[PDB]
């Protein structure tokens, strides 16, 4: 019954050492000038987070290449099998079905 | 409308993965495999409108094979048959 006590040790040792660094030896009530400083090594950034198109298409493209490796995942389990002409010719289909989805998108990527 | 192309020309588009007792790739059946094969034997040429009120025996046990509804109730009531008499004797059985 240790799997599950193989990790709750590892996380309670993890959260131990962070509160004996963030808490305990810390408490900065003295001068501790938390004024307007601490702005990540800069000043006031009156602009918000702007949209960037070339950094959105990288999210979606990965997601559609990520799905059909899970279809491709039980290939070693598809070895010790029955009829295997089917098993070979269907396994080669998905990879080409992944490969064409490159070549259409490959004619327009952009500065990724 | 239900064209049923796959009855004309003999490919199985799906069909295999439809009922609980069809193929079993290395022949490991289900928990109620004995009642599927028995119940489908009932209504084959029957047109299913008289099957709802005639067969009615091979379907009901099969519903009760799968959920174990009254088997769990006959078991649960034995926890109230005894087990108010925890202190009134009859351990039954002694270990082991």
């Amino acid at each position: 019954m240790n799997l599950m006590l193989a990790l709750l040790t590892n996380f309670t040792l993890a959260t131990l050492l962070v509160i004996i660094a963030f808490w305990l030896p810390q408490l900065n009530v003295y001068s501790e000038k938390t004024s307007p400083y601490e702005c990540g090594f800069d000043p006031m950034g009156s602009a918000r987070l702007p949209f960037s198109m070339k950094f959105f298409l990288v999210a979606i493209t990965f997601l559609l290449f990520d799905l059909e490796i899970a279809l491709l995942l039980p290939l070693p389990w598809a070895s010790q099998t029955a009829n295997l002409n089917t098993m070979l010719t269907m396994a080669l289909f998905l990879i080409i079905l992944l490969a064409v989805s490159l070549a259409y998108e490959w004619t327009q990527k952009g500065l990724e | 409308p239900f064209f049923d192309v796959q009855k004309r020309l003999g490919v199985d588009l799906d069909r295999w993965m439809t009922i609980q007792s069809a193929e079993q790739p290395h022949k490991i059946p289900s928990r109620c495999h004995a009642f599927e094969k028995e119940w489908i034997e009932c209504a084959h040429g029957i047109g299913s409108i008289r099957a709802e009120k005639e067969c009615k025996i091979e379907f009901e046990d099969f519903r009760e094979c799968l959920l174990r509804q009254k088997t769990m109730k006959r078991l649960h009531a034995i926890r109230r048959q005894r087990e108010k008499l925890i202190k009134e004797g009859k351990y039954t059985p002694p270990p082991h």
């Binding site: - | 409308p1 239900f2 064209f3 049923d4 192309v5 796959q6 588009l13 799906d14 069909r15 993965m17 439809t18 009922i19 609980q20 599927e36 299913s48 409108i49 379907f59 099969f62 519903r63 799968l66 959920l67």
Partner: protein
């Protein structure tokens, strides 16, 4: 762009075949899943900010209407485990079935799927493609048919024409006037479906024909009812006579062939000692005609062709399969002793 416009358009009707060619609830899930995937580009083509704010009102309405269907499958997976498309073995499943699928065909509840999409899509050209999505779930209610509660399928259908009727007398935009009376013609066919589920398809094949020929007439310039005035004396006066004939046919008047369904569909609705049910609906589609009269009072009486602009040139659009539509959508009432023995 041109070749990939076919492959998107080809797979729309390939999505709906698997809905019909199936013995398995998993495949009918895939069937009109990918239709909801392959309609979204056709909404877009010219990229106008109403269209993007219309397909997204289209989208999630057909995501949930998808999603409750898979909930209805997994309930009667637990009960007897058969996955053939047949009666659903559980009244808690079939109730969740029919009024989930009532969003894709949209009935009288699940309301504004129909006007809020079809209005203001700059692609008014077609959007005849909203006849497949009326055709896929009707092919699902042909099998599920002997397992319903008989009250819900009528209460969505008695409300259908009573509220699809009233909704459009307050309109000018003739896409909405086509979007309305498209719930009404979904009211006549599912009021009948428990009683002899064929002689439902008779109403549907008529409905594809008469609606498809309405949009092809509209593809000269026509946007609004005031624009429907200014083409009698300008474009072609034979267009005004044609646009009269189909509307008066689609109202159900017995010299034409939109009276072909009702005349036959009451032969089935009574013969089942149900008389107060058709007498309500038959008198209800009467103010479904006051769309069409008061629309025909625009174009066929020379109502103010002003702002002198001459079209001294000919017309070259593609009016494909138009010469044979108002010759089977008007003149067929004598020639159908049995259309309901071919389709049966």
């Amino acid at each position: 762009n041109p070749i990939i416009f076919i492959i998107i358009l080809l797979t729309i009707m390939l999505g709906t075949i698997i809905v019909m060619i199936s013995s398995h609830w998993l495949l009918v899930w895939i069937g009109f899943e990918m239709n909801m995937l392959a309609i979204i580009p056709i909404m877009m083509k010219n990229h106008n900010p109403r269209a993007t704010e219309a397909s997204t009102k289209y989208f999630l309405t057909q995501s949930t209407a998808s999603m409750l269907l898979m909930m209805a499958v997994i309930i009667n997976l637990m009960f007897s485990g058969q996955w053939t498309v047949m009666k659903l073995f559980n009244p808690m499943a079939s109730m969740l079935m029919t009024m989930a699928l009532a969003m894709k065909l949209g009935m009288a509840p699940f309301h504004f799927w129909v006007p809020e999409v079809t209005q203001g899509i700059p692609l008014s050209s077609g959007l005849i493609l909203l006849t497949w999505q009326k055709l896929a779930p009707m092919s699902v209610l042909y099998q599920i048919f002997p397992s319903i509660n008989l009250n819900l399928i009528l209460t969505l259908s008695v409300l259908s024409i009573l509220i699809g009727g009233w909704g459009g007398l307050n309109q000018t935009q003739l896409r909405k006037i086509m979007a309305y009376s498209s719930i009404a013609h979904m009211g006549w066919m599912t009021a009948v479906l428990p009683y002899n589920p064929t002689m439902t398809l008779l109403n549907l094949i008529i409905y594809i024909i008469m609606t498809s020929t309405m949009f092809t007439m509209f593809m000269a310039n026509s946007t609004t009812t005031t624009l429907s005035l200014s083409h009698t004396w300008n474009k072609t006066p034979i267009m005004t006579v044609l646009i009269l004939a189909t509307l008066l046919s689609m109202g159900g008047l017995p010299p034409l062939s939109g009276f072909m369904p009702k005349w036959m569909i009451i032969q089935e609705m009574t013969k089942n000692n149900s008389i107060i049910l058709p007498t309500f609906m038959a008198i209800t589609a009467l103010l479904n005609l006051y769309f069409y009269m008061r629309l025909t009072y625009s174009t066929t009486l020379t109502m103010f062709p002003s702002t002198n602009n001459m079209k001294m040139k000919w017309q070259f659009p593609l009016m494909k399969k138009m010469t044979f539509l108002p010759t089977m959508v008007v003149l067929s009432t004598m020639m159908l002793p049995l259309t309901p023995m071919l389709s049966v």
